[PDB]
Amino acid sequence: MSKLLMIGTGPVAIQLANICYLKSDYEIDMVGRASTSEKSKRLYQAYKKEKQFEVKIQNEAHQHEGKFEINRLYKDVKNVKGEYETVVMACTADAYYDTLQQLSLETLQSVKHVILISPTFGSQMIVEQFMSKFSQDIEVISFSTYLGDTRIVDKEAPNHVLTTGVKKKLYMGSTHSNSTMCQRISALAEQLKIQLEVVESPLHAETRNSSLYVHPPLFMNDFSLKAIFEGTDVPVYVYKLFPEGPITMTLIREMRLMWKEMMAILQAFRVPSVNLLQFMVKENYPVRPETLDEGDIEHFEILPDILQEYLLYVRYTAILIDPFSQPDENGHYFDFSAVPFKQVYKNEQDVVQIPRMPSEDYYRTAMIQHIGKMLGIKTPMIDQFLTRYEASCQAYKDMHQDQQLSSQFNTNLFEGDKALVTKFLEIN
Amino acid sequence: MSKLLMIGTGPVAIQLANICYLKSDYEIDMVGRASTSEKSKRLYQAYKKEKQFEVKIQNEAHQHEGKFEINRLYKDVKNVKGEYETVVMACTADAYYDTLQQLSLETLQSVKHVILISPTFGSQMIVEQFMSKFSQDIEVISFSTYLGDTRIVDKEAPNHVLTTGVKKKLYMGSTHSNSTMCQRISALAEQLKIQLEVVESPLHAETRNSSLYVHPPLFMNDFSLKAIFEGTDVPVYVYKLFPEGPITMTLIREMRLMWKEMMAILQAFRVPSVNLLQFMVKENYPVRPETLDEGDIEHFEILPDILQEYLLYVRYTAILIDPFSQPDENGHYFDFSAVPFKQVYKNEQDVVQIPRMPSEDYYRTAMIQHIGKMLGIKTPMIDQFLTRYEASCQAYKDMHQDQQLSSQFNTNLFEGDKALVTKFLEIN
Numbered sequence: 001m002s003k004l005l006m007i008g009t010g011p012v013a014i015q016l017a018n019i020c021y022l023k024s025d026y027e028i029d030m031v032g033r034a035s036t037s038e039k040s041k042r043l044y045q046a047y048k049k050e051k052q053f054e055v056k057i058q059n060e061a062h063q064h065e066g067k068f069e070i071n072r073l074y075k076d077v078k079n080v081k082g083e084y085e086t087v088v089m090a091c092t093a094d095a096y097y098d099t100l101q102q103l104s105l106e107t108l109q110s111v112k113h114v115i116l117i118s119p120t121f122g123s124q125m126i127v128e129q130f131m132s133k134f135s136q137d138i139e140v141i142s143f144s145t146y147l148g149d150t151r152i153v154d155k156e157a158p159n160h161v162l163t164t165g166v167k168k169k170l171y172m173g174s175t176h177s178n179s180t181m182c183q184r185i186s187a188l189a190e191q192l193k194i195q196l197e198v199v200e201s202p203l204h205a206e207t208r209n210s211s212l213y214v215h216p217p218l219f220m221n222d223f224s225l226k227a228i229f230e231g232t233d234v235p236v237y238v239y240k241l242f243p244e245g246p247i248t249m250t251l252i253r254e255m256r257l258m259w260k261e262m263m264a265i266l267q268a269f270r271v272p273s274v275n276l277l278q279f280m281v282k283e284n285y286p287v288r289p290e291t292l293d294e295g296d297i298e299h300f301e302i303l304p305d306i307l308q309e310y311l312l313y314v315r316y317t318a319i320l321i322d323p324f325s326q327p328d329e330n331g332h333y334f335d336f337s338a339v340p341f342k343q344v345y346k347n348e349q350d351v352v353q354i355p356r357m358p359s360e361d362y363y364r365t366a367m368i369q370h371i372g373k374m375l376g377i378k379t380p381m382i383d384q385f386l387t388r389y390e391a392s393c394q395a396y397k398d399m400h401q402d403q404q405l406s407s408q409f410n411t412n413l414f415e416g417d418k419a420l421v422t423k424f425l426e427i428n
Numbered sequence: 429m430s431k432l433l434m435i436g437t438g439p440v441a442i443q444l445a446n447i448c449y450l451k452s453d454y455e456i457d458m459v460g461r462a463s464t465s466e467k468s469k470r471l472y473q474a475y476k477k478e479k480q481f482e483v484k485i486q487n488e489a490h491q492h493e494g495k496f497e498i499n500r501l502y503k504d505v506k507n508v509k510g511e512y513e514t515v516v517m518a519c520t521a522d523a524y525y526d527t528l529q530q531l532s533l534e535t536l537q538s539v540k541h542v543i544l545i546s547p548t549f550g551s552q553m554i555v556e557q558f559m560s561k562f563s564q565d566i567e568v569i570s571f572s573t574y575l576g577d578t579r580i581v582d583k584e585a586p587n588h589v590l591t592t593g594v595k596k597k598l599y600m601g602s603t604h605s606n607s608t609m610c611q612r613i614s615a616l617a618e619q620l621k622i623q624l625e626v627v628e629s630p631l632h633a634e635t636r637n638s639s640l641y642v643h644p645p646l647f648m649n650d651f652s653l654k655a656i657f658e659g660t661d662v663p664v665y666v667y668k669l670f671p672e673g674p675i676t677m678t679l680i681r682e683m684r685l686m687w688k689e690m691m692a693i694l695q696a697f698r699v700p701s702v703n704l705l706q707f708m709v710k711e712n713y714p715v716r717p718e719t720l721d722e723g724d725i726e727h728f729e730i731l732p733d734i735l736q737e738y739l740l741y742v743r744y745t746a747i748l749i750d751p752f753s754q755p756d757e758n759g760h761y762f763d764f765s766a767v768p769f770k771q772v773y774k775n776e777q778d779v780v781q782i783p784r785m786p787s788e789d790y791y792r793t794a795m796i797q798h799i800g801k802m803l804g805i806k807t808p809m810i811d812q813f814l815t816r817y818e819a820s821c822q823a824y825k826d827m828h829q830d831q832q833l834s835s836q837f838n839t840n841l842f843e844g845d846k847a848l849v850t851k852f853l854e855i856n
């Protein structure tokens with residue numbers, strides 16, 4: 001019978017494992033890195049003891065809930081034995097290569113489908129090129145993003161996760177147009193009440209994620225980078241205006257410029273372009289009618305380069321509050337924009353980590369840089385983003401020679417991934 | 429000896445009376461409207477009883493303080509008897525004509541200088557044309573604004589006023605270039621430590637007031653006008669972003685358009701143009717360097733019509749807080765922008781009044797409209813401003829037929845003033 005390998009043991013992997021448990025005929029195996037990660041250990045110990053996972057639901061609009069037991073929970077990728085026709089990557093995109101490469105030849109040659117839950121731009125190119133050495137005909141499926149928001153509500157019971165929110169719309173593409181797997185997914189989406197736009201390549205679904213265009217400007221600037229690698233004297237906030245946070249005319253210019261460099265790479269691949277404003281306004285969170293002209297967001301992409309900036313700037317000020325929340329007796333709304341920055345932190349073994357943001361945006365940006373390099377496309381804003389982050393890494397190293405740092409502070413990361421997209425694009 | 433007539437008995441008039449008391453050789457007479465205004469009565473009764481005015485000071489940087497007694501406090505303009513070489517208009521601009529016209533022929537023919545403390549655009553034209561019938565050679569002096577901020581801290585002692593703030597820079601012009609009066613004023617300004625740019629006509633000083641360009645858009649729109657003539661369900665704020673207040677891309681367009689129509693009338697009069705952004709940023713309140721490009725505010729007037737909008741919009745979001753105030757332990761600054769709207773209100777005799785804003789901006793706008801009409805200059809944004817306010821007046825009349833309303837709800841106001849600027853411009 002059909003085996004499925006789930007790579008990742010966090011809340012995304014658990015939600016996904018439950019969907020397969022309930023709505024597929026796969027026997028499910030799960031693997032983390034409980035040998036080298038206190039987090040994956042806590043998950044291992046907890047599943048071991050209880051012999052169950054549980055998804056709970058917050059809005060009764062969702063029936064992903066359920067308790068469930070999987071077939072085998074592995075402790076490390078290296079223990080994985082045997083054949084699996086389907087492998088779901090529920091880990092972070094910068095680990096897709098590190099983890100597949102640790103699988104056995106028998107495992108890698110048995111695989112028919114690789115499904116990428118939170119891929120970045122070009123993850124499929126990396127994953128297809130890798131698998132191609134062992135699978136003649138590997139199918140690779142990229143999603144735009146994960147289906148919603150799920151979280152551990154108690155760190156001492158990480159096998160119990162909570163899905164708080166579900167996205168409106170997802171996109172999905174495959175190396176195999178309208179494959180049999182594509183069809184089960186959009187049929188599974190239908191059961192889940194999750195609108196799924198099937199898209200024509202995985203790369204195309206990978207560009208329908210808004211954070212790919214707005215996280216690099218928000219986080220890889222001197223303001224944000226100081227807040228993360230060094231303190232601030234006073235709490236400072238991701239989505240507020242300077243001096244309370246990073247947003248300025250300059251940041252918004254940096255965002256439009258990256259958007260346009262990305263649209264260059266996307267036209268190269270004959271991938272359609274993303275109306276960034278309209279994307280944010282219909283598929284992220286609405287603002288009041290009175291705030292944005294409907295023709296301004298429809299025709300966003302025709303508009304002059306400073307009108308585009310002006311409309312992006314305005315969008316971010318509309319969200320400093322939640323304009324659909326219930327006002328105070330004093331006129332005051334929910335402070336939607338007081339999201340703090342996670343700073344650098346020592347893990348359980350006293351090793352400094354960089355938080356997900358910006359260290360996942362260094363990976364995505366470093367890959368987008370590399371693709372654009374080899375299309376002969378110039379990425380000057382991307383370029384600046386990366387030197388900024390690297391100088392902040394080098395400065396942390398110099399300022400903190402008394403400390404164990406993590407592999408994230410290292411030079412020349414992702415040589416593996418960079419070579420796979422090189423082989424891929426030459427051959428393709 | 430030299431007599432001075434002070435028209436107005438509020439806190440501006442009292443501060444000014446003290447400056448003349450201390451630094452001039454004028455015997456001072458003061459006149460309000462204690463016959464028809466509970467406010468002017470309270471001032472009359474209070475001065476009567478105490479026989480003193482008092483200016484107190486808040487920042488020790490100021491020596492306008494002082495107790496003082498004037499020579500004669502009149503109860504109504506109509507009591508004014510005798511000859512005065514100088515008359516200071518310390519009242520609101522929309523009353524300059526109503527009040528002078530109540531003076532006696534002997535008084536009007538004796539007058540050599542009319543000094544306009546808070547004139548609007550074209551007040552001098554109105555005042556010179558009126559006085560010209562009685563004074564062959566009247567001198568008229570317009571200030572850009574009043575010298576600072578003074579207030580009554582206790583309504584039962586309105587003869588005791590408090591000057592809280594003093595402007596950086598004032599402008600001043602006269603019908604009589606570098607007159608003897610001009611010279612005493614800039615010498616008096618020097619004593620007061622108040623920088624005074626002497627300007628070449630009064631009209632020119634009357635355009636160096638920022639509220640002339642930004643009050644009509646802020647207050648004469650459907651949002652603001654609802655907040656003033658009808659409640660809001662929840663407190664709403666003058667300087668916040670929609671839905672908390674009126675500021676939108678649309679309001680900012682309405683502000684640039686009025687600015688440019690005004691710059692038309694100003695080029696007609698060969699008056700130089702006002703860099704509105706730079707005016708707000710150096711002469712009103714500073715924002716952080718990181719917020720506005722210095723070349724953007726220097727070259728503001730060359731910039732494209734949507735960049736101008738974008739920079740104005742951005743200026744207003746920089747001020748939602750005071751970015752130079754001391755932050756909270758939580759990152760949070762002083763809520764600089766939560767200035768409520770004064771709404772329509774019944775006075776002591778149960779008569780509905782419209783607050784200063786927008787009823788002083790209806791006068792200024794109605795005059796700017798009239799000037800531009802007779803230069804053949806089109807003022808389409810002004811035009812809209814005025815129909816908006818009038819429809820809100822008409823609606824209050826219909827919705828509130830059970831109520832005594834004030835003369836401010838009337839049609840065809842300012843016929844007097846409108847004819848004086850007509851005679852003036854034809855002849856001039």
Ligand SMILES: Nc1ncnc2c1ncn2[C@@H]1O[C@H](COP(=O)(O)OP(=O)(O)OC[C@H]2OC[C@H](O)[C@@H]2O)[C@@H](O)[C@H]1OP(=O)(O)O
Pocket residue numbers: 007008009010011012013032033034037038039040041077090091092093095098099118146
């Ligand atoms: N080299 C490597 N090898 C093996 N396992 C790895 C590796 N790197 C990360 N991970 C594991 O992926 C799992 C999911 O990541 P998690 O941080 O819990 O958050 P989510 O559950 O929300 O992740 C879902 C995606 O949303 C977007 C983002 O890209 C996420 O991947 C998690 O168990 C990770 O282990 P850990 O020990 O728990 O840290």
Ligand SMILES: Nc1ncnc2c1ncn2[C@@H]1O[C@H](COP(=O)(O)OP(=O)(O)OC[C@H]2OC[C@H](O)[C@@H]2O)[C@@H](O)[C@H]1OP(=O)(O)O
Pocket residue numbers: 435436437438439440441460461462465466467468469505518519520521523526527546574
């Ligand atoms: N038709 C008419 N006739 C006689 N007197 C009149 C008339 N209209 C207004 N006023 C008086 O002008 C005085 C100053 O006005 P005020 O509201 O106290 O505020 P401020 O002292 O701060 O004024 C200074 C200027 O700053 C800007 C603005 O244009 C101000 O004029 C005040 O005593 C008014 O009488 P009241 O009885 O007290 O209401």
